[PDB]
A and B are shown apart, each in its own frame.
Chain A
Amino acid sequence: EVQLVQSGAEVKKPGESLKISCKGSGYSFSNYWIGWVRQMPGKGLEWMGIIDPSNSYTRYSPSFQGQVTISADKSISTAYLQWSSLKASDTAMYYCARWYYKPFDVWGQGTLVTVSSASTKGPSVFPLAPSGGTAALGCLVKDYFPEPVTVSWNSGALTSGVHTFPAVLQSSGLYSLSSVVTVPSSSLGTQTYICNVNHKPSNTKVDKKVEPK
């Protein structure tokens, strides 16, 4: 089976160098060109460049020219994508794929690259207080690094009405997410609501009670 296998996810900081790999198997690697493609989270595919591994001929998109170096070592069936100085804006998924009479018939599984200036940091947890007979309340899990955080409500006992959103990576290099639960208006004051926030990387466990105004 023809395969391309890429190196594992990377978490790096601005200015650091990085070289990720794309390893071919089940075919003659030297005889087919390898393209590299960027995909910003939630965005489309962007062609970055291409390399002929037989002779090291490389061409780049004008958008990526000078920002990145594509290379290959045909003796070990591997192509590479390399940055001398990562930017936060390089945070993306990167795929390799081979040109073929069926072009890009085979793709790598992708390498996620996360670039942030942040050190490990536990979140600040802020209550989102409630203001057809139900009320929406939640917790703001602010300014943490890296992924992931776990959120539960009332130690897991409260699961209905709960939605915990995906995180945003802010311009600051830190993540934020939110978690909401819909609850009956008449249960406010009487019934107690606590979000349980777990951030393993920093060993932070926060219990925040969310109460009305």
Chain B
Amino acid sequence: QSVLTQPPSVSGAPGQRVTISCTGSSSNIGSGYDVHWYQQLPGTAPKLLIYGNSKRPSGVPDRFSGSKSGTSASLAITGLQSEDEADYYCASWTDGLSLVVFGGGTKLTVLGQPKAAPSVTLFPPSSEELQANKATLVCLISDFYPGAVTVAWKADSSPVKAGVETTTPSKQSNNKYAASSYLSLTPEQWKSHRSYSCQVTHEGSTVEKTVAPTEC
């Protein structure tokens, strides 16, 4: 259980400043090992950003800095830029059962446009799909920012986690974000419940849509 703990998300506006903590345990930072930082832009390999706690590889601007005191390492980014938007991972050698440990990662969002709540459209299974002996509820989530949502499905009022697939948000052409979630059911399941709900949580607020088998 050698572990490096990072906050899941940090955010700042362009030109502002953020810090990303990386809290260790006795086997890693606790044992004196150095911490290193990696930047990963969407669709690319991770890039070394800071090594040996505080050193910068050539090509890494001085806006990025790292420190390590006690059992805590930290990455500081000043003068935030939109190209800084990425996942950041801390890592170290360790003494435990593993030799190398990565932190869980921190998504940095650079807040260059205003917050937008998601628009949610919930489609019931089509007639054509039902006559094919299947039923898929389609929850489409559009026009939101920042690009992070959590989706929860409800059968009547009870949670359903089985048969759920959800996409990671991606940019619409209008530069806001969209995502989708699917609930697969037997036509029997669809018919046996009063109604079904897609609940989308975005920045601590939940927008919910509901469909029922009996309504047109």
Contact B97 A62 (CB under 8 A): yes
Q: Once bound together, how far apart are the Cα atoms of A138 and B100, in whole Å?
A: 46
Contact A126 B128 (CB under 8 A): yes
Q: Once bound together, how far apart are the Cα atoms of A97 and B48, in whole Å?
A: 10
Cβ-based interface call for B205 (8 A):
no
Q: Once bound together, how far apart are the Cα atoms of A178 and B165, in whole Å?
A: 12
Q: Once bound together, how far apart are the Cα atoms of A171 and B208, in whole Å?
A: 26
- Binary contact readout A92-113 vs B (1 if CB under 8 angstroms, 0 otherwise): 0001010001111101111000
Question: Which of A7-15, A77-85, A161-169, A188-196 lies at the interface with chain B?
Answer: A161-169
Neighbouring A residues of B89 by C-beta, 8 Å: 44-45
Neighbouring A residues of B101 by C-beta, 8 Å: 47
Of the candidates A35, A44, A97, A180, the one whose C-beta lies within 8 Å of that of B105 is A44
Q: Which residue of B lies closest to A105 (CB)?
A: B48
Which residues of B16-68 have CB atoms within 8 Å of chain A's CB atoms? 36, 38, 40, 45-48, 51-52, 55, 57
Total A residues in contact with B, Cβ cutoff 8 Å: 45
Contact B105 A108 (CB under 8 A): no
CB distance from A86 to the nearest CB of B (A): 21
Decide: A104 near B99, CB < 8 A? Known: A165-B180, A168-B165, A168-B166.
no
Decide: A124 near B46, CB < 8 A? Known: A46-B102, A50-B100.
no
Which residues of B163-216 have CB atoms within 8 Å of chain A's CB atoms? 165-168, 170, 172-173, 178-180, 182, 184, 216
Neighbouring B residues of A41 by C-beta, 8 Å: 168
Contact A104 B36 (CB under 8 A): yes
Cβ-based interface call for B138 (8 A):
yes
Interface residue SS majority, chain A = strand
Of the candidates B100, B121, B136, B170, the one whose C-beta lies within 8 Å of that of A165 is B170
Of the candidates A101, A129, A138, the one whose C-beta lies within 8 Å of that of B140 is A138
Neighbouring B residues of A156 by C-beta, 8 Å: none
CB distance from A133 to the nearest CB of B (A): 14
Neighbouring B residues of A140 by C-beta, 8 Å: 123, 126, 129, 136, 138
Cβ-based interface call for B73 (8 A):
no
Neighbouring B residues of A47 by C-beta, 8 Å: 91, 98-102
Contact B126 A103 (CB under 8 A): no
Q: Which residue of A lies closest to B100 (CB)?
A: A47
Q: Which residue of B lies closest to A213 (CB)?
A: B216
Cβ-based interface call for A203 (8 A):
no
Neighbouring A residues of B140 by C-beta, 8 Å: 136, 138, 165, 178, 180
- List the interface of chain A (C-beta within 8 A of B): 35, 37, 41-42, 44-47, 50, 59, 61-62, 95, 97, 101-105, 107-110, 124, 126-129, 136, 138, 140, 142, 162-163, 165-170, 176-178, 180, 213
Shortest 8 CB-CB distances between A and B: which pairs?
A168-B165, A44-B105, A107-B45, A42-B168, A102-B51, A165-B180, A47-B100, A128-B123
Query: Can you sample 16 A-B contacts with CB below 8 Å?
Result: A45-B38, A45-B105, A102-B36, A102-B52, A104-B36, A105-B48, A105-B57, A140-B129, A142-B129, A163-B172, A168-B180, A176-B182, A177-B180, A180-B121, A180-B142, A213-B216
A-B contacts besides A107-B45, A163-B173, 16 pairs, CB < 8 Å: A44-B104, A45-B46, A45-B102, A61-B98, A101-B52, A102-B51, A104-B36, A128-B126, A138-B123, A140-B123, A142-B134, A165-B140, A165-B179, A168-B180, A170-B165, A178-B180
